[PDB]
């Protein structure tokens, strides 16, 4: 009974991986330049297809109760994902002209609320694996990430001073 402990990992590890990005980016995403904003759609337009095979897998890793929500959540991820990647795609042609750093602070919103949602997905149904659990037959932090996120939102503040086509449109519109 410990040889699926892999996927049940996995599923839980990328939902904090893609959150380090999310932020990170969110950084340097002012300085951000045409050379490293290319690439930094790759990273995040991975997070959102990747949630949907790590979830997938987590189904069944986590007690039948939260299958409705994490069902919707399945689609939901999809329009994201081409939220994220259509903004972020502006700024890769609007930053030749002069109004860069503009759609960049999109960008930051909703990529706000995409390593929020990332997360809120495994912290919801975290509550059922841990109800069963704590009760009867009990046979990378979440903390981390609760800081981090924190100061992704001052760093927009201010300055230092189908669901499986869509997919694959979309990578080929990004590859060329």
Same mark, same amino acid.
């Given at each position: 009974?410990?040889?699926? !402990?892999?996927? &049940? !990992?996995?599923?839980?590890? &990328?939902?904090?991986?893609?959150?380090?990005?999310?932020?990170?980016?969110?950084?340097?995403?002012?300085?951000?330049?045409?050379?490293?904003?290319?690439?930094?759609? +790759?990273?995040?337009?991975?997070?959102?297809?990747?949630?949907?095979?790590?979830? !997938?897998?987590?189904?069944?890793?986590?007690?039948?109760?939260?299958?409705?929500?994490?069902?919707?959540?399945?689609?939901?991820? &999809?329009? !994201?994902?081409?939220?994220?990647? &259509?903004?972020? +795609?502006?700024?890769?042609?609007?930053?030749?002209?002069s109004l860069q750093q503009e759609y960049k602070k999109q960008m930051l919103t909703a990529a706000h609320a995409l390593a929020v949602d990332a997360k809120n997905l495994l912290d919801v149904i975290d509550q059922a694996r841990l109800k069963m659990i704590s009760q009867s037959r009990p046979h990378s932090n979440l903390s981390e990430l609760d800081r981090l996120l924190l100061e992704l939102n001052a760093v927009q503040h201010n300055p230092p001073s189908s669901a499986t086509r869509e997919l694959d449109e979309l990578m080929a519109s990004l590859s060329d």
């Amino acid at each position: 009974m410990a040889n699926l !402990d892999r996927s &049940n !990992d996995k599923v839980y590890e &990328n939902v904090t991986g893609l959150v380090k990005a999310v932020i990170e980016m969110s950084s340097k995403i002012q300085p951000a330049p045409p050379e490293e904003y290319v690439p930094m759609v +790759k990273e995040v337009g991975l997070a959102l297809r990747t949630l949907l095979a790590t979830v !997938d897998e987590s189904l069944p890793v986590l007690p039948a109760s939260t299958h409705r929500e994490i069902e919707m959540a399945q689609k939901l991820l &999809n329009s !994201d994902l081409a939220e994220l990647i &259509n903004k972020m +795609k502006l700024a890769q042609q609007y930053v030749m002209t002069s109004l860069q750093q503009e759609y960049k602070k999109q960008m930051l919103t909703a990529a706000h609320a995409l390593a929020v949602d990332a997360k809120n997905l495994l912290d919801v149904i975290d509550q059922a694996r841990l109800k069963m659990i704590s009760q009867s037959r009990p046979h990378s932090n979440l903390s981390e990430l609760d800081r981090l996120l924190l100061e992704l939102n001052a760093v927009q503040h201010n300055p230092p001073s189908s669901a499986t086509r869509e997919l694959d449109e979309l990578m080929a519109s990004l590859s060329d």
